[PDB]
Symmetry: D2
Subunit: 210 residues, 4 copies
């Protein structure tokens, strides 16, 4: 198992590992070792009726590189395991296209440039404070929320479906939607029957059926 999807300017979602497949839910539901029409029908049956515990026996590990404002939202998802890096310094700079629909009173390129400029100033201050003898944990508090971080995320398919309901949705901020779309893409590749049944029966958001 290995997939990697680039997100934003420097981000990514990378698949590290997966335990199981669609049939792992079928086996869990039946408490059996079965290894097709009947099995798809059971997955659909479980999804329609909200019998989601069998999907907890499918597990993914992802490696995610995302800005802190994104990771902070993501880490609100309690039913999962996280290890975050505690070092490189890179920042998410929104592209000009990101800023359209909004009739900004300055050109979107200049908004991009203003963001780049303040990020550069904060980063230079951070580096000065460090070279001055300030400990990193203190100096780092000037750094902006668009600083990239990386983490490992281990999550089961049920909790992943919850994650997608909330984040693969127009009510979510655009940046996390882009991460959710990549998470969805990998889920679909690894668990096509579960994913399709999720979309058909259980998915509460808008963007995945668009």
């Amino acid at each position: 198992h290995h997939m990697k999807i680039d997100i934003l300017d420097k981000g990514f979602v990378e698949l590290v590992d997966v335990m199981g497949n669609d049939l792992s839910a079928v086996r869990a539901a039946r408490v059996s070792f079965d290894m097709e029409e009947r099995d798809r029908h059971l997955i659909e049956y479980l999804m329609k009726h909200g019998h989601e515990t069998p999907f907890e026996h499918i597990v993914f590990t992802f490696h995610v590189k995302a800005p802190i404002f994104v990771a902070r939202q993501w880490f609100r998802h309690r039913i999962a395991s996280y290890n975050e890096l505690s070092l490189s310094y890179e920042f998410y700079i929104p592209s000009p296209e990101r800023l359209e629909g909004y009739k900004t009173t300055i050109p979107p390129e200049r908004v991009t440039e203003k963001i780049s400029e303040i990020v550069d100033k904060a980063y230079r201050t951070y580096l000065e404070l460090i070279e001055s003898g300030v400990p990193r944990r203190v100096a780092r508090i000037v750094l902006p929320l668009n600083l990239y971080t990386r983490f490992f995320w281990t999550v089961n398919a049920r909790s992943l479906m919850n994650f997608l309901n909330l984040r693969a949705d127009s009510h979510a901020q655009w940046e996390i939607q882009q991460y959710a779309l990549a998470i969805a893409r990998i889920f679909k590749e690894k668990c096509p029957w579960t994913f399709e049944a999720f979309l058909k029966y259980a998915y509460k958001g808008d963007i995945l059926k668009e």
Copy 2:
């Protein structure tokens, strides 16, 4: 699949596993030399950094008496699917005579064993007569004894499994679940030998796994 027999008719069988010792190293490093990797495992265990071990996950298939399952299912940080009937066999745990020896008893331990057998057969007979009379299964089943075997799948990460071993692979736990915990330990050790050894050395709070190999 590794399958270890426990009690008279029980077992623990490994269904699947995600990762191995290196899964905790990669998670600690957040990064996708064998002695350096082993050193990190010991370091994490020694200094109480337990979260990397959540990235190693097991699924077991367990057949156990209900009184054992009831204790086991108290472990909340795990996923369970138990046999019900709408997606059964009827066997019962009968303790061996050796199970009961030591406790000063008034009758012989083999008679205690037969007295348990006798009451199990009477209760199962009543269950069958109720069923064949039209009583629905999940009402008739309430007369069956707590030593009735059940089966379940259990998906559990290594951190939670280690908590489970602390509590159940220990002489304060009832002897029956101790036996199941010993089997869970054997499998954990086989798949994650570096984690297991570090766990014994630095974090394990129980008594039995320091003395009983595997």
Copy 3:
């Protein structure tokens, strides 16, 4: 508040943290009570429930004391997002289904005789238990002969969001009748303590059948 359930069971409220307004204060992140406005606060509860913002309800918490048969407790304890403490001084009482429990089904003996047969095997299993305990068998070994209808007791501490999940699944005709009866009591106490949350739960979020038909 204590409500009798089945022949010897009960649900008893031990404690409660908060009320409907606890969810409102958590949603707003404000412990400012000098601007209370009932209409506004009740509208927020509805809005949260309507749009699936469930986390504010986690700041209302209950503790119950429940006496139920083991086969009921086994189902109930599958609800992981909660805290349990079960009895391990002990009493020995068993749930014997009433004749009316066992009609609706076409039994080939009278429902009366089913009750008698269940009572009789319970008595026999209990006598055997006692015989083994007098003989020197440790109590935790002798008890394995006791039937699944043996009563147990537990404390259950659970937040309102998890409680609503419990009601979705257990206050429902797909649940076994015995745990339905317990869920109806749990619902009654929830409604008494958090009436606005309960009402909005039924209107917008509740997935089961029974609570929409059966008052309280």
Copy 4:
């Protein structure tokens, strides 16, 4: 009611509490229906043997105002409930370390100058934030330039067992100093409301140094 100021603008305040020491005792005994010495002895017994489940039946709600870098560490504690500040209005304040914060480390510029440089960035970053917002950039996008020392507020509902785990990890000299200060206040409130449980915790179970 109980409020403790933390850092330059932060706080921990107690919103509510369910139960007290006797809630763990009732839970352990499974008994709703006095003997002080016996009840203290049970609490000590549970703590020293690691029978921690009874302490799950004591629950707290706190209202906390903390910089984001502190809140990021705190929210890693999963066995709890959080609501962070659309429903309520937003203010913009930032944690500026005091010069004494930098005492011990031998810096190449005076500590007051470090304070000053941190204030400079806050001002410039916040001024850029406002420029971007006045220009039609959405707040959720403009705010990405703001530093990690921006204050946020949240409600935290947590049981006493989970609170003890939090204190083990955060009331400790290995935790960053700022979250230590918050943990100290959490511990104080816990001590006030559950003195027997807290005392037993220090005696037998607490793994940190600072408490």
